[PDB]
Structures are given as structure tokens and as C-alpha cells.
Amino acid sequence: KTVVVTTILESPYVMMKKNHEMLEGNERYEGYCVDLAAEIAKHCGFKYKLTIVGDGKYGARDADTKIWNGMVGELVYGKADIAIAPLTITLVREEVIDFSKPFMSLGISIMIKKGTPIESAEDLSKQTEIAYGTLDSGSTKEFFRRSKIAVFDKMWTYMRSAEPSVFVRTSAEGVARVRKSKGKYAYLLESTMNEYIEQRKPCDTMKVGGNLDSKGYGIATPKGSSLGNAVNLAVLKLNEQGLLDKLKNKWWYDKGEC
Amino acid sequence: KTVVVTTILESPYVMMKKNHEMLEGNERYEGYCVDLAAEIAKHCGFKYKLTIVGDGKYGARDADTKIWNGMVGELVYGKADIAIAPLTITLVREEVIDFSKPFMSLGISIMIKKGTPIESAEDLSKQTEIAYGTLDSGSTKEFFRRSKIAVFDKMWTYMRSAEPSVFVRTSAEGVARVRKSKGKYAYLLESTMNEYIEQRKPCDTMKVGGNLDSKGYGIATPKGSSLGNAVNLAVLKLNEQGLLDKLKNKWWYDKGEC
Ligand SMILES: N[C@@H](CCC(=O)O)C(=O)O
């Protein structure tokens, strides 16, 4: 009756502890989602096993094979009982798995190298010297592609045809590109990651402007799983009790290096 | 098979149109939730009738009789098919009705008459000169009643017993009390409402400090209703289409006076 939890190595959600090689089982891991898993399991009265998603992906459907990858695939295909991770609640995912109400909110945001003369999306859109882009797939890119807002439409037209490519293959790549580009690249990404990186050495990036959209991370379970009802109530309780806000502070701010 | 929508008069979510006595049915109303209802109906392929909740309340469960009032009551007891309203998703409500993923975020916040020497809940809690209260039969009051967070527990202990009563029957009543009390009343209400009022004449109130919590409004249906899955998908679709932010921007900000 041990619950198999799928999650992903993404800081500060799930990280290998300092001495992890000398440790076993759930004790190898630390982070926001590790803490959150422990609290959900306590509330629902279950034992569980943390497992890192085999392919290191969140969950997208291949247009050709129709196969779901990532944590969503592990749920869809019966390999895990619950995903506890920074997994964005999207329409296509909601169609195939069940989600709790969100445990954390986020929106698209702008990361700059400190000293970059940019304070908003409008600022980016009106100029050319400072390049800017998104992950080469997912929620952030799709936001721009689809936007009917003039500023964002202008930004998309620019990003889609910019040379060399302004797209990056991973979050770490986007962050590195801001850091290496001497103020000549701004990266559009989730607020949560932006805010986390801002609190980390070498303390050379900053989040600017308001968020461009709004979405949430949810706990996911296989469609119709009986675990879903209980974990959803657990999320609502933990939020109301102030525990979710505490955990955010714990992992983003309390020991911020900046 | 007309779907009966319960809702509530609350600006800018649902408002009486100017010539409403000369108007019929759904055409009597305007606002964010009126627009949202139309969009959800369109996505979901139903006809509907907007109805204003009979008792003018959001919804709470009486501790003695255990009966639910407000919009929640109308869903619980079978008097409406769906609520499309600024209806906060809470644990106690989630137990008795179904909710979509949130279509708007909010937190409890403090409204003051401008120059009132209060910057935080802590400030309110440490003094008695400036009275403070909340809306009856809503999630803000239920939050304080249930809170084990020390500062909020202290504020509830005060509010529950304050004379004369610090509680109001409608959001508009709390706002008027703030405006008429020469800085000696502060009103605890949701950030969304606070920010709307802050940008309306006579421009004499302000939101102070950070939000006290973080939560969201959901579209609600009776537990197990078939409309639920569909309406939830609609909310996700509308968010991904930019329509929720469009409506927010339309009814807030665009309508600012101050
Ligand atoms: N949105 C709240 C009402 C407003 C309040 O309680 O401040 C509810 O659903 O009860």
C-alpha cells in the first residue's frame, strides 16, 4: 500500500542532499516538494516512496505516437500513483490526469542580468539591442505564439524570426544565457524559477516587471484515482494553515544567498 | 434544461446595468462574471439564467443547525445548477460542492481610510483604537474563525466579541463604514475588491500591507454534477486563450478613476 510518488530533480523542489550517497530511500532528497510530500502523506495517512521521473520530463504528448512522456506519462501508464512536482495545470494535461487545486501560483516573468535597462515586456518589445527569448517548447512559448496583445504579438514576431535563435532547450540554458550575454539577453520564464535564481549566488540576475499571465502547479493523480479527493483537501488545508507559505519562504528566502 | 446560475451583486463582478428596470433577464446585468458566464456557456453549449442569490450571501455553515446559506447553500440544496461568482475555494466548501480550478487569485487584505496608522495585521492586532471587521457569511470570516495562526486567532478573539458589531452584511457596507469612520474602522476584504475600490472615486481608501493569505475563486457546481468536468475545462481553455486576463483588465484597471 506504499504510494509511488513521481517527482523531478528541479531546485528547490527536489534536490539531492549533501550526503545523499550515504543515505537511502526518501532520505536522499530535500526540497519544497519533498516537504510537501511528507505533509500530504501525514494528512492522508499513507506511506510513500519518492521516485525521480525516468526521462526527467514534465509531461507532453508526442504528436505522432500519441505517447505521453514525463511525470504525466508515469501516471497515464500506471507507473506511479501521484506526481508531486512543479507541474503546471494545463488543459491538455487536465484531459488525461486529475489535478488538485493549485499549491503554488506562477506567471511568465522577465529575467535580466543586473544593470540591463529593461523594466517591462513593453520595454523589450520596443527595442532590438537586447535579445530575448523563451524555452523552445511549453507554456511560456505558447503564450507568445497565441497572444492577441499587441506588445506580446510584437515580441513573438521578433522571437520567431530572430537569428541566431533566441530559444533555449532548458531552463538552465536560459539562465546561463542571461549570465553570459553581458546584459544583451533577457530570458522569459516562470516567476517561481526567476525568484529562486534571484536569491542564489552569484546574485547577478533580477526579476523585472509584473507577471504576464497566471497559472498554477497542481498535484496530479491518474484519472479517477481515489487518492485525488484526499490529496486535494490536503492541499487546501495546508494552504489555509499557512504551511505552503512557510515552505515557500523556507526554500526561496530563509537561506537566500543574496 | 436552462441552467440556473446563482450569483451575487458585487462590483465589478455582477452589477445592475444603468437602465435595468427597462431591461429583461440576463440583459439586466453586467460585469466580469456576466462576461465569464457568457463565455463558459458558449464553450459548454448551454442556455442559462442569471439569478441573484436569494439571501445575498456567499455561504457559510451554521455551527448549531449545520445548514449552509448563500450561494453554497443554493448548490448544496439543489436550488441552482452552477455558481459563477467571486466564490472562494476553501476546504470546508470543497467538502460539500465541486469547484473548477481557480479563474482568479486573491488574498485577504486590509482596507483603510487614507492616513490611518496601520500597516499590517500585526498592527491591527496590537491595538483597540481602530476597530476592524469582515463580511458576514463569507470566506474571510470563516478564515479568521478557524485560524490557529496566533495573530489571526488574536484578531478573531477580538472581532467575535467586539461591541458594537464589527461585521457587515455586504461588501458595500464595510466600504462605507471605512469611508465614514474617520480612520477608526479598517475592513478585512479580498485583494480583488480592495484594489477595485482603491481606483474609484472618491479615492479615499487604500490597501495596506501584504495579503494575509493566498487563494482563488472557482466556478462551483453541486458535488458530482455532470456540468463540473466541462466547466473546469472551459476555465483552463479561457485562461490559455488570455480571456480571463482580458476580462480582468476590462473590469478593473480600464475602469480606474483615481
Ligand atoms: N469571496 C468570499 C466573499 C468575500 C469575503 O469573504 O471577504 C467568499 O466566497 O465567501
From Swiss-Prot, chains A, B:
<protein>
    <recommendedName>
        <fullName>Glutamate receptor 2</fullName>
    </recommendedName>
</protein>
<feature type="binding site">
    <location>
        <position position="86"/>
    </location>
    <ligand>
        <name>L-glutamate</name>
    </ligand>
</feature>
<feature type="site" description="Interaction with the cone snail toxin Con-ikot-ikot">
    <location>
        <position position="237"/>
    </location>
</feature>
<comment type="function">
    <text>Ionotropic glutamate receptor that functions as a ligand-gated cation channel, gated by L-glutamate and glutamatergic agonists such as alpha-amino-3-hydroxy-5-methyl-4-isoxazolepropionic acid (AMPA), quisqualic acid, and kainic acid. L-glutamate acts as an excitatory neurotransmitter at many synapses in the central nervous system and plays an important role in fast excitatory synaptic transmission.</text>
</comment>
<feature type="topological domain" description="Extracellular">
    <location>
        <begin position="117"/>
        <end position="258"/>
    </location>
</feature>
<feature type="site" description="Interaction with the cone snail toxin Con-ikot-ikot">
    <location>
        <position position="61"/>
    </location>
</feature>
<comment type="subunit">
    <text>Homotetramer or heterotetramer of pore-forming glutamate receptor subunits. Tetramers may be formed by the dimerization of dimers. May interact with MPP4. Forms a ternary complex with GRIP1 and CSPG4. Interacts with ATAD1 in an ATP-dependent manner. ATAD1-catalyzed ATP hydrolysis disrupts binding to ATAD1 and to GRIP1 and leads to AMPAR complex disassembly. Interacts with GRIP2. Interacts with GRIP1. Interacts with NSF via its C-terminus. Interacts with CACNG2, PICK1 and GRIP2. Interacts with GRIA1 and SYNDIG1. Part of a complex containing GRIA2, NSF and NAPA and/or NAPB.</text>
</comment>
<feature type="binding site">
    <location>
        <position position="140"/>
    </location>
    <ligand>
        <name>L-glutamate</name>
    </ligand>
</feature>
<feature type="binding site">
    <location>
        <position position="93"/>
    </location>
    <ligand>
        <name>L-glutamate</name>
    </ligand>
</feature>
<feature type="disulfide bond">
    <location>
        <begin position="203"/>
        <end position="258"/>
    </location>
</feature>
<feature type="binding site">
    <location>
        <position position="190"/>
    </location>
    <ligand>
        <name>L-glutamate</name>
    </ligand>
</feature>
<feature type="site" description="Crucial to convey clamshell closure to channel opening">
    <location>
        <position position="118"/>
    </location>
</feature>
<feature type="modified residue" description="Phosphoserine; by PKC">
    <location>
        <position position="147"/>
    </location>
</feature>
<comment type="similarity">
    <text>Belongs to the glutamate-gated ion channel (TC 1.A.10.1) family. GRIA2 subfamily.</text>
</comment>
<feature type="modified residue" description="Phosphoserine; by PKG">
    <location>
        <position position="181"/>
    </location>
</feature>
<feature type="binding site">
    <location>
        <position position="88"/>
    </location>
    <ligand>
        <name>L-glutamate</name>
    </ligand>
</feature>
<feature type="site" description="Interaction with the cone snail toxin Con-ikot-ikot">
    <location>
        <position position="145"/>
    </location>
</feature>
<feature type="binding site">
    <location>
        <position position="139"/>
    </location>
    <ligand>
        <name>L-glutamate</name>
    </ligand>
</feature>
